[PDB]
Design a protein around this ligand. Structure first.
Ligand SMILES: CCN1CCN(C(=O)N[C@@H](C(=O)N[C@H](C(=O)O)[C@H]2N[C@@H](C(=O)O)C(C)(C)S2)c2ccccc2)C(=O)C1=O
Ligand SMILES: [Cl-]
Ligand SMILES: [Cl-]
Length: 520
């Protein structure tokens, strides 16, 4: 006869989206345990008990007999509270129940990368569950139980320490936008036969991450055949060369230098530029000269390179650093990369050119979206947040309002002008942005791959008062082309349309507005 201590499970904190939609919830479950010593005196009830647990008669009997000398075994864990009381209703001697919790993720794969999961011991091992584990964790309680000589429980004596629940956490994510983004990125991956991808949506005024989705993904509620590669929150932890998607920042440096103005014309013939042993090449070569806007519309590597030689790498480096490329986001998401903005003491022409058109630096999709947000928010950068923001934070003017306005207009033309990225047009709205395509880095050697690509699009909308910024990255498309303006642009179009509608943003381009918007 003796008193034993028994744990009282604590409620882990609720994780919700920005509007209270549950993303991670501790749900009540019932574990059944048995005192084999008591069960051994009621052998005649076993077949009935075994059947009610869906276990084979002899296998169940073997279990109990092999543990006859023990005072405690688990019969089954994670029953619904109703099923547990169904078994306890049979009043089999030696069978007891205890209330426990199971962590459940109602959106499953849709937000697996951001939210993460807890392991068997209720510790966060990935994502937000890891990052806020101390905040979310409850502290389990304790109570005393009196047992007789045969381990039979005859009295609950007292609670020695109450359980304390963890705290609720509201993420910045809008689950509605997350569902839309998840579905459209998945469709694009499959249509394009791509290996992976990411999509980020950002509130340009508040810095809040409204959506963050990647492929491949996984179901955190059933991780039985989970492979490591599918667990990666690529938007935060994978870096890439952004290519021509950083040209707007090179252009901002030019415009801020005092040496360039939008009407200036750059000679780009014949669409290549030799600098020692290296050859800078333009993909499209149907122009001998281009104005500043045309350098972006036609995405001229040669054009931006000549501008970079004139203004110097330092001015470009400086803009990129200020908008957050290669810089710590301050988010503290587990595994998150800072990336790399190269800094030489002396900048050769080669490095100066490649920086300006987006190679030799590494960024994340989150950083790229953050930099576009600053541009969209009339040159004012606000800190990123993955938790709900109540008050608009004070921003930092990283690009002048005048320059940001001029670059916004250029990027609107990149989407809307003839020869532009027309697949990025958003019905009902004026949108602005820049596509990109990058050759992937060679496996097993230095240099770039001949037939493997990363497709990019980054932009914001609506042009008249930007509300959200979005980055789409698709890795190794193989079925319907590879250029960013063919692959990632239409994903931007569809997701931006949906997002703006879901957030009730009024259409600013009614000529192209669909029937449903022309009435509201
Ligand atoms: C540092 C050396 N090094 C590294 C590798 N490297 C590139 O991988 N270059 C890219 C490139 O130039 N892509 C263009 C861009 O984004 O501007 C295209 N993207 C299209 C689109 O987004 O639809 C477009 C607007 C129609 S043009 C390329 C070239 C050829 C085929 C695919 C991709 C360089 O250039 C380069 O010198
Ligand atoms: Cl490699
Ligand atoms: Cl290849």
């Amino acid at each position: 006869r003796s008193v034993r201590h028994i744990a009282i499970p604590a409620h882990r904190g609720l994780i919700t989206d920005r509007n209270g939609e549950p993303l991670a919830v501790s749900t009540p479950v019932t574990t059944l345990w048995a005192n084999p010593k008591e069960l051994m005196t009621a052998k005649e009830r076993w077949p009935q008990l075994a059947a009610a647990l869906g276990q084979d008669t002899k296998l169940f009997a073997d279990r109990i007999e092999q543990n006859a000398e023990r005072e405690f075994i688990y019969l089954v864990r994670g029953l619904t509270p109703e099923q547990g009381e169904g078994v306890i209703a049979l009043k089999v001697p030696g069978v007891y129940s205890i209330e426990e919790f199971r962590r459940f993720y109602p959106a499953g794969e849709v937000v697996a990368h951001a939210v993460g999961f807890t392991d068997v011991d209720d510790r966060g091992r990935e994502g937000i569950e890891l990052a806020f584990d101390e905040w979310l964790a409850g502290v389990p309680g304790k109570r005393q139980v009196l047992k007789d000589r045969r381990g039979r429980v005859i009295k609950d004596v007292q609670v020695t320490k109450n359980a304390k629940p963890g705290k609720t956490l509201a993420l910045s994510i809008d689950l509605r936008l997350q569902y839309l983004a998840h579905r459209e990125l998945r469709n694009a991956l499959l249509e394009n036969g791509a290996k992976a991808g990411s999509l980020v949506i950002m509130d340009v005024k508040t810095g809040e991450i409204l959506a963050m989705t990647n492929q491949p993904t996984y179901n955190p509620n059933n991780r039985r055949n989970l492979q490591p590669a599918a667990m990666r929150n690529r938007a935060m932890i994978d870096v890439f060369e952004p290519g021509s998607t950083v040209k707007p920042f090179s252009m901002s440096a030019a415009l801020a230098s005092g040496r360039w103005k939008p009407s200036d014309i750059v000679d780009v013939y014949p669409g290549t530029l030799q600098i020692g042993r290296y050859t800078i090449r333009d993909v499209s070569r149907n122009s001998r000269q281009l104005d500043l806007t045309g350098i972006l519309i036609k995405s001229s590597n040669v054009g931006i390179s000549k501008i970079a030689f004139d203004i110097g790498a330092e001015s470009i480096y400086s803009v990129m650093q200020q908008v957050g490329l290669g810089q710590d986001t301050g988010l503290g998401f587990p595994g998150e990369r800072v990336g790399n903005l190269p800094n030489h003491r002396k900048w050769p022409k080669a490095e100066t050119a490649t920086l300006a058109y987006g190679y030799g630096l590494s960024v994340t999709a989150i950083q790229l979206a953050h930099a576009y947000a600053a541009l969209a928010n009339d040159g004012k950068s606000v800190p990123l947040s993955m938790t709900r923001v109540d008050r608009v934070p004070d921003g930092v003017q990283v690009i002048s309002p005048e320059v940001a306005s001029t670059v916004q207009g250029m990027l609107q033309q990149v989407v809307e002008a003839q020869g532009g990225v027309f697949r990025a047009q958003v019905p009902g709205y004026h949108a602005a942005g820049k596509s990109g395509t990058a050759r992937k880095v060679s496996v097993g050697t230095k240099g770039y791959r001949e037939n493997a690509y990363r497709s990019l699009f980054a932009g914001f909308a609506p042009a008249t008062d930007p509300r959200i910024a979005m980055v789409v990255v698709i890795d190794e498309p193989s079925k319907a082309g590879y250029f960013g303006g063919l692959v990632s642009a239409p994903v931007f179009s569809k997701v931006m349309a949906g997002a703006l509608r879901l957030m009730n943003v009024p259409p600013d381009n009614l000529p192209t507005a669909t029937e449903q918007q022309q009435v509201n």
